[PDB]
Amino acid sequence: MLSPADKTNVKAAWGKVGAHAGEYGAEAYERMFLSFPTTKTYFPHFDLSHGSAQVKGQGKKVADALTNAVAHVDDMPNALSALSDLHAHKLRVDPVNFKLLSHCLLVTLAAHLPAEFTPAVHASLDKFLASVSTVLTSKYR
Amino acid sequence: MLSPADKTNVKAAWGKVGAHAGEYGAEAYERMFLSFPTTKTYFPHFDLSHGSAQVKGQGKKVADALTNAVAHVDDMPNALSALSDLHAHKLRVDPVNFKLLSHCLLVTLAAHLPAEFTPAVHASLDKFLASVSTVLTSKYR
Amino acid sequence: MHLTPEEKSAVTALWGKVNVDEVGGEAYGRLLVVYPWTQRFFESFGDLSTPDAVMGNPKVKAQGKKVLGAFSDGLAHLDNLKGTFATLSELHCDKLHVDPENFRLLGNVLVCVLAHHFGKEFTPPVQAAYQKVVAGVANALAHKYH
Amino acid sequence: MHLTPEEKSAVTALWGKVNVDEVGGEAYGRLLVVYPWTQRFFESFGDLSTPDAVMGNPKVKAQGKKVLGAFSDGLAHLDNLKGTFATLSELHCDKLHVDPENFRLLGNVLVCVLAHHFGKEFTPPVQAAYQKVVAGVANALAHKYH
Ligand code: HEM
Ligand code: HEM
Numbered sequence: 401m402l403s404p405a406d407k408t409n410v411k412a413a414w415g416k417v418g419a420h421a422g423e424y425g426a427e428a429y430e431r432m433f434l435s436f437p438t439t440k441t442y443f444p445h446f447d448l449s450h451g452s453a454q455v456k457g458q459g460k461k462v463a464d465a466l467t468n469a470v471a472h473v474d475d476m477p478n479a480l481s482a483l484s485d486l487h488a489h490k491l492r493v494d495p496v497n498f499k500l501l502s503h504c505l506l507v508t509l510a511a512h513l514p515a516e517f518t519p520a521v522h523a524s525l526d527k528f529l530a531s532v533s534t535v536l537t538s539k540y541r
Numbered sequence: 542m543l544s545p546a547d548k549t550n551v552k553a554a555w556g557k558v559g560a561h562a563g564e565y566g567a568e569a570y571e572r573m574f575l576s577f578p579t580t581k582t583y584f585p586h587f588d589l590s591h592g593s594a595q596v597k598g599q600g601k602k603v604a605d606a607l608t609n610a611v612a613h614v615d616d617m618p619n620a621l622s623a624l625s626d627l628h629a630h631k632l633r634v635d636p637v638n639f640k641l642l643s644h645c646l647l648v649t650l651a652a653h654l655p656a657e658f659t660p661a662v663h664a665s666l667d668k669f670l671a672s673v674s675t676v677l678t679s680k681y682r
Numbered sequence: 683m684h685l686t687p688e689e690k691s692a693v694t695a696l697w698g699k700v701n702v703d704e705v706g707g708e709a710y711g712r713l714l715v716v717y718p719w720t721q722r723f724f725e726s727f728g729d730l731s732t733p734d735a736v737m738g739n740p741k742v743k744a745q746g747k748k749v750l751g752a753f754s755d756g757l758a759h760l761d762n763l764k765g766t767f768a769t770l771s772e773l774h775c776d777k778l779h780v781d782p783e784n785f786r787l788l789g790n791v792l793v794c795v796l797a798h799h800f801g802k803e804f805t806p807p808v809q810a811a812y813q814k815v816v817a818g819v820a821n822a823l824a825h826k827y828h
Numbered sequence: 829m830h831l832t833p834e835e836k837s838a839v840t841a842l843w844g845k846v847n848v849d850e851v852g853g854e855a856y857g858r859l860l861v862v863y864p865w866t867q868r869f870f871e872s873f874g875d876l877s878t879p880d881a882v883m884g885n886p887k888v889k890a891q892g893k894k895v896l897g898a899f900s901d902g903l904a905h906l907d908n909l910k911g912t913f914a915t916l917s918e919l920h921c922d923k924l925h926v927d928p929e930n931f932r933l934l935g936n937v938l939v940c941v942l943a944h945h946f947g948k949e950f951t952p953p954v955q956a957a958y959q960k961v962v963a964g965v966a967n968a969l970a971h972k973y974h
């Protein structure tokens with residue numbers, strides 16, 4: 401469960417991300433594809449080279465969904481409903497990969513938020529991405 | 542989430558386990574210790590040989606907890622609250638091990654329920670043990 | 683892969699009783715039932731609407747036969763699972779785009795099917811030996827991913 | 829484990845800029861903060877009541893120094909991690925009863941700490957090299973478990 405301090409921590413840190421959210425989402429995917437090459441099995445239809453428009457676009461859509469989730473942190477199942485449908489029924493990404501992207505989003509935030517990524521904020525961000533991941537895989541079966 | 546059909550399936554299967562629940566719980570731990578040796582790190586104070594009374598005792602406690610969870614399948618968080626506190630704050634079993642014990646509980650049930658372990662019942666029991674596992678690790682952080 | 687002499691003997695003795703086609707259809711059908719997101723690679727296979735539909739589907743049975751047939755062949759080369767499955771590893775990565783986590787899920791359902799079919803004979807030590815083998819085959823099939 | 833020559837070079841170059849004691853205290857503290865179940869082995873360590881208490885705990889810093897010092901020395905033997913960490917593997921299993929999943933969690937926190945510390949210098953390719961290394965060290969420390 402996300403405590404009230406976690407929600408405060410996540411809003412502060414994601415608020416700092418601000419306009420760079422989309423860029424950081426793209427970098428998290430790039431990091432995941434390089435560090436965990438099996439995740440590329442879900443994007444054989446994309447140009448995965450560095451800088452690709454398709455990866456930037458994926459990054460921006462994922463970041464906007466995270467912004468939405470942070471804005472609706474007390475009702476994430478509802479806010480992410482369409483995306484939980486999409487992942488469960490069409491994309492069908494193995495649940496294991498959500499932890500890989502989450503780790504790469506944490507590494508990207510760490511690399512871009514020197515001031516904000518304290519131990520407490522790291523823990524809250526980790527819990528938040530695990531919560532988001534749980535919502536996104538909740539309808540898989 | 543557990544559907545009404547899942548709950549029906551779990552109650553039927555666990556109801557057939559009946560008085561053998563404790564034996565089956567002990568076998569599940571025995572299977573887990575042999576198949577996944579790292580899980581023995583949590584029981585350095587036990588004699589883990591086949592037939593050990595300590596393993597039979599642990600099996601009986603875990604089985605009784607599962608009977609209680611089945612009995613309260615719509616209100617698992619509260620029924621398992623003392624056990625979520627115990628695992629989170631004292632035992633501190635890494636969350637990865639719950640998947641290992643759950644798999645060994647399924648293999649035990651399969652080996653003892655030729656008629657009942659159909660594909661649909663297997664899927665329900667796997668969801669059910671994942672659900673119980675999620676409740677048991679819900680207070681870890 | 684390294685198995686004790688007892689483990690290897692346990693795997694070979696049980697495998698001598700396995701009807702590879704029957705166990706293959708059962709384990710592959712259960713993979714699609716128990717972890718239904720795995721149906722993403724089998725869109726052209728027809729009716730997968732219910733558990734009975736999946737289990738009775740001739741394409742599902744045929745795919746399970748192919749898979750367990752290659753697994754069965756791999757049991758003759760337990761000292762070199764990576765070499766034995768290298769070609770299928772590259773195939774599953776480069777052409778089929780299958781996340782290797784699926785190999786682990788299939789291994790878990792195959793162990794459950796062996797337990798269901800053999801009952802008490804699938805003892806804790808026999809299961810431990812088969813766990814090492816399914817992990818080894820999954821690792822071998824994932825080895826050429828890049 | 830096998831690393832490309834670029835990856836070995838990337839690992840060695842970044843590590844030359846690391847204050848091992850400081851990064852060890854930071855990563856070990858963050859392990860206990862971010863995954864608090866890891867505090868199970870450290871009941872004698874004093875105050876772990878808050879994130880600041882954990883990070884400032886002398887015993888936690890000391891433990892971090894001992895862990896990262898061994899890790900650091902392991903980076904000179906990237907072609908023989910299992911041999912290098914064999915005795916520590918036996919110790920963590922037989923005497924300390926540490927679940928090897930804790931090694932993976934420490935690896936994940938270390939990568940986050942290197943990203944925090946080095947910022948943009950911890951590029952995607954540098955991270956991918958470090959991911960291979962922390963998985964290699966965790967696997968090496970888990971190898972003698974039985
Ligand atoms: C925080 C976790 C995640 C979030 C919030 C998320 C969100 C999204 C969003 C917003 C879209 C685009 C929907 C649209 O265009 O209508 C999408 C598509 C997609 N996602 Fe997820 N996703 C997550 C994790 C993952 C993971 C871990 C993978 C695989 C490794 C993945 C694979 C995909 C794929 C393949 C698509 C479709 C891309 C295309 O063909 O354009 N996602 N996701
Ligand atoms: C279905 C999942 C599980 C359930 C329902 C469960 C339930 C229980 C119960 C009812 C107890 C006894 C509590 C008491 O004596 O007051 C217990 C103790 C314990 N459990 Fe869990 N458990 C589960 C999973 C695990 C796993 C996966 C592990 C480790 C691999 C584990 C390790 C332990 C340990 C070490 C103890 C204390 C044993 C002793 O020292 O006597 N449990 N658990």
Ligand code: HEM
Binds near residue numbers: 724
């Ligand atoms: C023990 C593990 C497995 C083995 C040994 C194995 C082996 C094989 C073999 C021999 C083929 C036939 C290739 C050909 O002649 O072109 C095949 C096809 C295929 N496999 Fe696997 N496989 C395994 C697991 C999986 C899993 C778990 C999945 C995904 C859930 C998968 C996905 C596929 C797909 C999509 C095809 C092509 C099916 C078609 O013809 O439409 N495999 N595999």
Ligand code: HEM
Binds near residue numbers: 898899916919924
């Ligand atoms: C990169 C991973 C790790 C390395 C290289 C490592 C290395 C070491 C070393 C060199 C020692 C001292 C051994 C001696 O006294 O001979 C040690 C002790 C110990 N380690 Fe680890 N360790 C690692 C991860 C962990 C983790 C994740 C945990 C638990 C969360 C842990 C728990 C312990 C404990 C409890 C001790 C005994 C401390 C004492 O006696 O004061 N280790 N470790």
